[PDB]
Amino acid sequence: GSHMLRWKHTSSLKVANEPILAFSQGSPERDALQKALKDLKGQTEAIPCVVGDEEVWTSDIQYQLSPFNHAHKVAKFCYADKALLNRAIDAALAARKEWDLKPMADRAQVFLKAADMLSGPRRAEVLAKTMVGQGKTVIQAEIDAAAELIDFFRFNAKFAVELEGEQPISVPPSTNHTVYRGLEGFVAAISPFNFTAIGGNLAGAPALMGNVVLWKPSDTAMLASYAVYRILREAGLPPNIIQFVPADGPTFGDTVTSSEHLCGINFTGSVPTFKHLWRQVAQNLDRFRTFPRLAGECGGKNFHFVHSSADVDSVVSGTLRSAFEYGGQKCSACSRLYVPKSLWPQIKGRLLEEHSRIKVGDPAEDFGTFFSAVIDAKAFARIKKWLEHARSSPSLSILAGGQCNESVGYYVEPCIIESKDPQEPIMKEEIFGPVLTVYVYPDDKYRETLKLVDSTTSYGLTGAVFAQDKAIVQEATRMLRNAAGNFYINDKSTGSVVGQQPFGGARASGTNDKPGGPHYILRWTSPQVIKETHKPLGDWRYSYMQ
Amino acid sequence: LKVANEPILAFSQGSPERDALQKALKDLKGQTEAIPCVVGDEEVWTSDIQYQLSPFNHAHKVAKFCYADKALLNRAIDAALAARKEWDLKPMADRAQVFLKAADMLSGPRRAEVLAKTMVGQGKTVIQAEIDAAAELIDFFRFNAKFAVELEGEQPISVPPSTNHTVYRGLEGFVAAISPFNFTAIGGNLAGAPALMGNVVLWKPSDTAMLASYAVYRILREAGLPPNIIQFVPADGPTFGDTVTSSEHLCGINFTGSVPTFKHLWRQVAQNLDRFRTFPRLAGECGGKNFHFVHSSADVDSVVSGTLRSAFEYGGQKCSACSRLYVPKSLWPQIKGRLLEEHSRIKVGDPAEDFGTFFSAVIDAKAFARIKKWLEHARSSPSLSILAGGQCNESVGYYVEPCIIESKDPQEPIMKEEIFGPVLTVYVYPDDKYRETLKLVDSTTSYGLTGAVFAQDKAIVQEATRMLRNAAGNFYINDKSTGSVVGQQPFGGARASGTNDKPGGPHYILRWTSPQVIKETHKPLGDWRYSYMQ
Ligand SMILES: NC(=O)c1ccc[n+]([C@@H]2O[C@H](COP(=O)([O-])OP(=O)(O)OC[C@H]3O[C@@H](n4cnc5c(N)ncnc54)[C@H](O)[C@@H]3O)[C@@H](O)[C@H]2O)c1
Ligand SMILES: NC(=O)c1ccc[n+]([C@@H]2O[C@H](COP(=O)([O-])OP(=O)(O)OC[C@H]3O[C@@H](n4cnc5c(N)ncnc54)[C@H](O)[C@@H]3O)[C@@H](O)[C@H]2O)c1
């Protein structure tokens, strides 16, 4: 009764979060970052599409601009045409079986090696490219392009290696084993401008699980995205496993959703784009060899809710960070603040005072900068329209900021607005700019106002409650259960850390597959269970039939 | 929570279980149950009266039920939504208790009832009802309860001065559970697993499995399931799909059935995306065109008994049933002779009256008609030859004899299309073309559900396993392609066969939770500035 299939013991991996560096004066990391920033000043990188190991140029030339100095073209790249995208698909599919058959531990090694490169010798590079290309300050680049990306790679490797140890029960005369197959076909990874790490995860997590990927990075994050790609290849990712294919968005979506071999879309960005892709897949359902898996994390209209028992200083600092870091360009950024009347004079005074101290400027040249320009001309225009709405709306008053200037960079000052109307459109719609709206509620209506927090918007991403009263915290936690997939008690609504706050939310905010947690990788495997029986079968009849 | 598989009973003469089953069968002979829709605790009748017939004696109406209209379905949604928050807030263990109690009831005092209702209402024999309505259903309930309670123990890293905790929220909205005729247990799982995870559910059972489905429902309610957590709402299929996909509160569809129906629901959801409060989650397990592939080194007796069981048990009405057998020329005289001899001994008849019955009538007139079309095709096609069987008679029951067909064309439509009847097609390949034929096993059909290789050569088994990696989500070496057991062979497959969420394994329940992570910080936050800025 010898076993013809033999299964090897599965190993474990010890990982921990990547430490955040301090960038203190004279420190090696501060010196290295300054050098890398100097290396990028006045430079434009010509970034090709990469299919297999071939650098390919099309005639559709595009430029990435430095948000705080838009005269500086930080990258010249090109959009893959439909022909090149289809060639990339074919090549990826031809490489898939071998990659899928590789031991999980061997695929994981690529990402572990990449993580170590990012941690050490390439840290300054990816930080600097994120600063110059996406407009991040030192610490915003550090938490993103270094820590979060490194953590995705290490933690997902751990989760994936350990997943193979999740095996079914065997009873004589049979042995059962689960094979965690990659998905059959190719995955389209479509990433947003605002986090370098998200691009790496969107393309990298499916690849880890044995998939092949067409990665269309965000135009406005091209420089750092390519840096990450090159690191993966240097770390040993074989050719045709991730195709680096910048492209016109609609063109890319049209092409991948037209392929019979599409098996997944891993998306992060706006709701309408995700819905469009979902509908395109549904329209073409009959052509696909299998049912494609769509993962999408989208926007939020996130709240900080203050109870009268709150620590005022914590409300102020936490809210300033959440609303204004990276110019409020986070899916998790606080954009609505609910304050009880009893605390409003104290909080208003402190917000206005601290507001006056916030420095907006060039993050490469002035490390005193709290945040810099927003990402591009389109973002600037949208934010400007909202500022104009605030000035025109009788229910809205600008308390601080309101200025903007796109002469050199896409600069918008932090803006604090008070709304007398808790249902004003500005309380509902995601601006993705440094624009905080405050609604002041009477203390005696806190319960009713909690219902407003829950019902006002279509989103369910992040939210915080500031309160020191335990009963109130318990009550608010119950009431806001579905208002936030990442919920915070006495901390700011941003800054989720891999393995500590797995990230995502529902309602209109996406599919909530919790990248950063141990279950995310399951979306990118389609398990097979093998049963081997070690003894001859008996008769087809059963004894009870006699 | 520690859990083991429910024993499969032998039903020997004089055994407690055989005596109890015979009594339960006697209790049901000549009976018609009037089965209402159940919304909350309200038993509701509409004018749209329907009947479930006994497949092997269709003059016997085993149940009278009714279709919920759009208005009733919408009231059921409203009532379920109003009950959801409290249920979702209940500790996982408290919800699990309902299913553990239900499992104990099914194992013991209600075992004979659910078996008998599955036999009389769906046409199963004793052992097919036993592995389904008892063992599989009990196992779904016990194993999913274990998986769910243990999932709560999966928690994130906390680092001072913050504590992090994951709350495994149910999905916000209601889940539509749409179950098939062929397994009583699948209905229980499709409605039960989401409910376990804090969801509320509109369950539309299969018309042709109504009697046993309602029995399961009542057991859940008696086991402590509160009102409005699972609504028991038989309905016309299209009416149900239209109604649930039209609700802004739809958050999931848990489906098992045909590919076209699942695709239709998928498209309806996509059409209505802008109306939904969140993105609904669709889970669908659909059909298969499953293979048994034989290498020349195979144990012939195992091939023969395993294939007869896989192809013909429950009339081949399994998503996992073998319908294409590939045999090397060198073994064909043996396998052909044995299949045809054993075929002559297969008893098709009344499973309640004759425990000697191997399998009974197919489920309904529509299935009978579809299968007859395939038999007529086999008589027409120049590449197909009926080797044994081919008879069918719907005068008393929907009776189809087991049929064995040889195809000279490995790509014939009968080798590709799911028949869901007791119809086995055999392709004989030259021994030296074994690798080419393995490739054909993989490339011929659109499906990826189950398959088996029979071989006693290690290198061949290893090669075949690698080559057929995506041809079967449940793959078997030297065993039949049916009969997955919860916790041992989590079940499902890809290609056209569905979403492959592996019910019966530890990860299935994750489709029915939308986690929230709570971070609590225990010290004041300090300045908004950072040190490097100074
Ligand atoms: N929930 C999260 O984890 C998360 C994280 C980051 C950003 N976001 C969200 O992303 C949004 C801002 O980012 P954005 O500007 O890049 O959004 P966006 O939808 O405009 O673009 C996102 C990506 O989709 C691409 N794209 C656009 N149309 C496409 C199409 N038809 N087919 C294929 N790809 C297409 C873009 O080129 C880009 O790469 C915000 O709503 C923000 O909240 C969410
Ligand atoms: N992969 C698996 O695990 C698995 C298990 C059991 C059965 N099946 C498959 O089920 C199929 C046969 O079962 P079937 O006869 O019930 O198929 P079916 O798709 O016609 O019906 C299944 C269910 O869907 C309902 N239905 C039909 N149209 C609907 C609509 N528009 N909206 C909502 N509900 C609708 C039916 O009433 C029934 O309850 C086979 O293909 C078989 O392979 C698969």
Side-chain angles (χ1 to χ4, degrees), chain A residues 1 3-7 12-24 26-34 36-37 39-40 42-72 74-96 99-108 110-112 114-165 167-229 231-259 261-282 284-340 342-349 351-352 354-358 360-377 379-384 386-390 392-446 448-469 471-534 536-545, chain B residues 4-12 14-22 24-25 27-28 30-41 43-84 86-100 102-247 249-262 264-270 272-274 276 278-328 330-337 339-365 367-372 374-432 434-435 437-438 440-457 459-522 524-533:
Chain A
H3 298 198
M4 296 183 276
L5 296 180
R6 299 295 182 90
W7 306 112
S12 56
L13 188 54
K14 302 291 186 287
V15 304
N17 290 97
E18 178 72 12
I20 297 290
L21 306 184
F23 297 89
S24 298
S27 69
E29 71 269 17
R30 192 176 176 119
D31 285 345
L33 179 55
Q34 282 165 338
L37 288 166
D39 288 338
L40 292 176
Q43 309 287 351
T44 302
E45 185 182 1
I47 296 172
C49 295
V50 183
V51 174
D53 289 326
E54 183 186 357
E55 295 184 12
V56 182
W57 284 92
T58 68
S59 57
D60 194 350
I61 298 299
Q62 300 289 327
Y63 297 93
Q64 180 190 2
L65 312 180
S66 183
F68 53 88
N69 182 22
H70 47 57
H72 180 195
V74 307
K76 178 186 78 176
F77 64 101
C78 64
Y79 279 167
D81 54 5
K82 300 185 76 177
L84 182 59
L85 294 173
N86 282 128
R87 184 153 83 75
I89 288 167
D90 293 348
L93 295 172
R96 186 193 62 79
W99 175 247
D100 180 38
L101 287 167
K102 266 198 183 310
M104 186 84 76
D106 294 353
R107 299 192 295 247
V110 170
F111 295 91
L112 294 167
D116 284 341
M117 295 167 69
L118 288 159
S119 174
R122 306 293 265 276
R123 204 196 196 90
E125 175 192 342
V126 301
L127 266 45
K129 290 177 171 175
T130 301
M131 291 179 65
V132 173
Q134 290 140 269
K136 294 204 170 184
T137 58
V138 173
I139 186 60
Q140 288 304 306
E142 163 74 357
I143 63 177
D144 170 16
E148 187 181 327
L149 181 52
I150 291 166
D151 288 347
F152 278 138
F153 285 177
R154 298 213 185 100
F155 279 85
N156 283 326
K158 176 190 172 70
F159 298 144
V161 165
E162 297 181 354
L163 174 61
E164 296 199 314
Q167 292 293 328
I169 293 164
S170 298
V171 176
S174 310
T175 298
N176 303 303
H177 178 83
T178 297
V179 175
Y180 292 95
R181 305 178 304 193
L183 316 181
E184 183 178 47
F186 75 95
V187 175
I190 297 162
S191 54
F193 76 90
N194 64 333
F195 283 88
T196 294
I198 292 186
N201 190 43
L202 292 176
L208 170 69
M209 301 308 285
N211 297 287
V212 297
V213 178
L214 268 67
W215 180 17
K216 192 205 77 69
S218 167
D219 291 6
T220 46
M222 192 59 54
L223 187 68
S225 296
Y226 190 51
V228 175
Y229 181 75
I231 289 167
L232 284 169
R233 300 309 311 284
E234 291 181 27
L237 190 72
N240 298 305
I241 306 313
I242 297 172
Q243 312 289 40
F244 191 81
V245 285
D248 171 70
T251 301
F252 185 80
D254 291 357
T255 302
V256 303
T257 61
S258 290
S259 175
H261 303 292
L262 180 71
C263 63
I265 297 176
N266 203 9
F267 175 84
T268 297
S270 78
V271 172
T273 297
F274 187 59
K275 283 180 174 177
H276 177 67
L277 293 168
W278 184 301
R279 287 182 163 125
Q280 287 191 302
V281 167
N284 286 342
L285 205 51
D286 295 318
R287 82 180 51 191
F288 304 121
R289 190 184 188 179
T290 192
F291 293 94
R293 296 182 178 190
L294 269 57
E297 312 293 8
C298 309
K301 185 77 185 179
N302 318 290
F303 63 86
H304 278 193
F305 177 87
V306 181
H307 179 257
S308 63
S309 68
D311 182 76
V312 166
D313 284 341
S314 292
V315 170
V316 173
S317 64
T319 303
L320 293 176
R321 277 192 178 177
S322 185
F324 302 137
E325 289 184 305
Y326 192 44
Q329 303 175 113
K330 301 188 179 183
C331 63
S332 52
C334 170
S335 59
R336 41 180 182 136
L337 175 68
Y338 296 80
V339 183
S342 69
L343 289 189
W344 180 227
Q346 291 188 70
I347 288 172
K348 185 181 181 176
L351 281 172
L352 294 183
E354 297 305 318
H355 175 277
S356 77
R357 303 313 299 174
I358 295 173
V360 173
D362 183 323
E365 303 303 317
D366 187 355
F367 283 7
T369 293
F370 188 53
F371 73 94
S372 193
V374 300
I375 190 67
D376 62 17
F380 185 94
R382 179 184 60 259
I383 295 162
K384 183 171 183 174
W386 280 107
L387 298 178
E388 288 168 347
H389 169 71
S392 302
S393 177
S395 60
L396 300 185
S397 63
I398 298 183
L399 305 184
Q403 310 87 357
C404 59
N405 182 349
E406 65 173 341
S407 68
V408 176
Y410 306 111
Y411 281 113
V412 181
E413 298 300 314
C415 183
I416 303 176
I417 294 162
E418 180 179 0
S419 179
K420 299 299 183 177
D421 178 3
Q423 302 302 329
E424 227 275 343
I426 203 175
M427 293 285 294
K428 294 175 176 282
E429 305 180 35
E430 190 184 44
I431 299 166
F432 238 62
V435 184
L436 173 63
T437 303
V438 184
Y439 177 70
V440 180
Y441 71 91
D443 292 52
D444 61 8
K445 289 177 71 168
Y446 87 93
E448 290 82 4
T449 304
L450 282 172
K451 287 181 185 297
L452 295 188
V453 175
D454 186 44
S455 72
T456 294
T457 83
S458 69
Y459 299 103
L461 197 37
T462 72
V465 171
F466 288 83
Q468 293 180 140
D469 184 309
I472 290 298
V473 167
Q474 295 175 358
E475 178 180 23
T477 298
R478 173 179 58 78
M479 295 181 70
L480 300 173
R481 182 174 179 93
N482 276 113
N486 281 84
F487 184 70
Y488 297 88
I489 298 161
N490 296 321
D491 212 330
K492 63 171 177 63
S493 66
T494 59
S496 65
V497 171
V498 171
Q500 300 176 25
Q501 300 90 30
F503 186 78
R507 293 182 178 168
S509 298
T511 51
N512 194 23
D513 299 296
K514 288 300 199 192
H519 303 121
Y520 180 64
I521 51 163
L522 291 166
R523 295 303 289 138
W524 310 113
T525 176
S526 179
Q528 176 194 48
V529 177
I530 298 174
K531 174 190 189 184
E532 180 180 357
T533 289
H534 310 298
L537 307 177
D539 194 51
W540 51 270
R541 297 181 184 78
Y542 296 80
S543 62
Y544 83 91
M545 291 167 61
Chain B
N5 291 94
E6 181 73 7
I8 293 292
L9 310 179
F11 291 86
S12 297
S15 63
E17 69 271 19
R18 189 182 177 116
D19 287 342
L21 179 57
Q22 293 176 320
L25 287 166
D27 284 342
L28 288 177
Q31 306 294 346
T32 306
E33 186 182 3
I35 294 171
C37 292
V38 185
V39 177
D41 288 327
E43 297 180 7
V44 185
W45 287 91
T46 71
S47 60
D48 200 348
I49 298 300
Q50 303 292 327
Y51 297 94
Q52 184 193 0
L53 311 181
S54 180
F56 53 89
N57 182 21
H58 46 56
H60 177 198
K61 295 172 171 58
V62 308
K64 176 187 71 180
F65 64 101
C66 65
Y67 280 164
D69 54 13
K70 172 186 173 180
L72 182 56
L73 290 176
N74 281 325
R75 290 203 297 99
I77 288 162
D78 293 337
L81 295 171
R84 183 194 64 80
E86 181 186 351
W87 175 247
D88 180 39
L89 282 167
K90 199 175 288 289
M92 189 81 77
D94 288 349
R95 297 193 296 251
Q97 195 54 41
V98 170
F99 297 90
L100 295 171
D104 284 342
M105 295 169 63
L106 290 161
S107 172
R110 306 292 267 272
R111 205 196 194 95
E113 175 192 342
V114 300
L115 263 52
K117 287 176 175 179
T118 301
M119 294 178 62
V120 172
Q122 293 138 269
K124 297 208 169 181
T125 58
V126 172
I127 187 56
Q128 291 302 305
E130 165 71 358
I131 70 178
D132 169 18
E136 185 183 345
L137 180 55
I138 289 163
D139 288 345
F140 276 137
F141 287 178
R142 296 210 185 105
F143 281 83
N144 284 325
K146 170 193 168 72
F147 295 145
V149 163
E150 293 182 348
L151 175 60
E152 291 211 314
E154 172 59 65
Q155 293 289 326
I157 299 163
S158 292
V159 175
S162 306
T163 292
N164 301 302
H165 184 78
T166 297
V167 173
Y168 292 95
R169 304 179 302 192
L171 315 182
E172 184 177 41
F174 76 94
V175 173
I178 296 162
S179 52
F181 77 88
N182 64 332
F183 284 89
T184 296
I186 291 176
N189 187 48
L190 289 177
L196 167 67
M197 304 306 289
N199 297 287
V200 297
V201 177
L202 265 67
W203 179 16
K204 194 202 78 65
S206 166
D207 290 6
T208 50
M210 195 59 54
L211 186 69
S213 296
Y214 190 54
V216 172
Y217 181 74
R218 289 304 316 158
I219 286 164
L220 283 169
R221 300 307 311 282
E222 294 184 24
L225 192 71
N228 292 307
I229 304 312
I230 300 176
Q231 311 289 39
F232 191 82
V233 288
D236 167 73
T239 300
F240 186 81
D242 293 356
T243 304
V244 304
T245 60
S246 286
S247 172
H249 300 298
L250 180 69
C251 63
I253 297 179
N254 205 7
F255 174 86
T256 294
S258 78
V259 171
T261 299
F262 188 59
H264 178 64
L265 293 168
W266 188 298
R267 285 173 163 153
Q268 288 189 301
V269 166
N272 285 345
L273 265 197
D274 291 321
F276 301 122
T278 192
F279 295 91
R281 295 181 178 192
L282 270 56
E285 311 294 8
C286 310
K289 186 72 183 180
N290 315 293
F291 62 89
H292 278 190
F293 178 86
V294 182
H295 178 256
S296 60
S297 67
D299 183 71
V300 169
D301 282 341
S302 297
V303 168
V304 169
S305 68
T307 302
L308 291 173
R309 279 189 178 177
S310 184
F312 300 140
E313 288 184 306
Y314 192 47
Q317 300 177 115
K318 299 189 183 182
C319 62
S320 55
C322 173
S323 58
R324 48 182 175 132
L325 172 73
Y326 297 79
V327 179
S330 65
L331 290 188
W332 178 226
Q334 284 179 256
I335 289 168
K336 184 180 187 185
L339 286 172
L340 273 40
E341 174 63 20
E342 295 311 302
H343 173 278
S344 70
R345 296 302 190 95
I346 291 174
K347 291 185 164 176
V348 173
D350 180 326
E353 299 302 317
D354 187 353
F355 284 6
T357 295
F358 188 49
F359 72 95
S360 192
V362 301
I363 189 70
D364 62 16
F368 182 93
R370 183 186 62 260
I371 296 159
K372 179 172 186 176
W374 282 104
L375 296 180
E376 290 282 273
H377 170 69
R379 305 186 175 279
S380 298
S381 174
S383 62
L384 301 183
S385 177
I386 295 176
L387 303 184
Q391 308 88 356
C392 66
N393 187 330
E394 62 178 330
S395 67
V396 172
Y398 303 111
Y399 279 115
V400 184
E401 300 294 317
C403 183
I404 302 170
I405 293 162
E406 176 177 10
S407 179
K408 302 301 188 178
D409 180 356
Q411 306 270 5
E412 227 273 344
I414 204 173
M415 293 286 292
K416 296 174 177 179
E417 301 185 33
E418 185 183 50
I419 298 170
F420 238 64
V423 184
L424 172 65
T425 303
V426 185
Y427 178 70
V428 181
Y429 70 89
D431 291 57
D432 67 341
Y434 96 84
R435 183 179 171 81
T437 305
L438 273 174
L440 280 176
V441 172
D442 179 65
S443 67
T444 296
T445 85
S446 297
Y447 294 105
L449 197 41
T450 73
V453 169
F454 289 81
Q456 295 178 110
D457 178 309
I460 290 291
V461 165
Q462 290 172 343
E463 177 179 30
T465 296
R466 192 180 57 255
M467 294 182 73
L468 299 170
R469 182 175 181 96
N470 274 117
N474 280 84
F475 183 70
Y476 297 91
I477 295 296
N478 297 326
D479 212 332
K480 66 174 174 57
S481 68
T482 59
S484 63
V485 171
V486 169
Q488 299 179 23
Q489 301 90 27
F491 185 80
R495 293 181 180 167
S497 296
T499 49
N500 196 20
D501 300 297
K502 289 303 199 185
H507 305 124
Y508 181 67
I509 54 171
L510 292 167
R511 295 303 290 135
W512 312 111
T513 177
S514 181
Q516 173 193 49
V517 172
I518 299 174
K519 173 188 187 188
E520 180 178 2
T521 293
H522 307 286
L525 299 186
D527 189 25
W528 50 270
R529 307 166 181 82
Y530 292 81
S531 63
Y532 83 90
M533 294 169 57

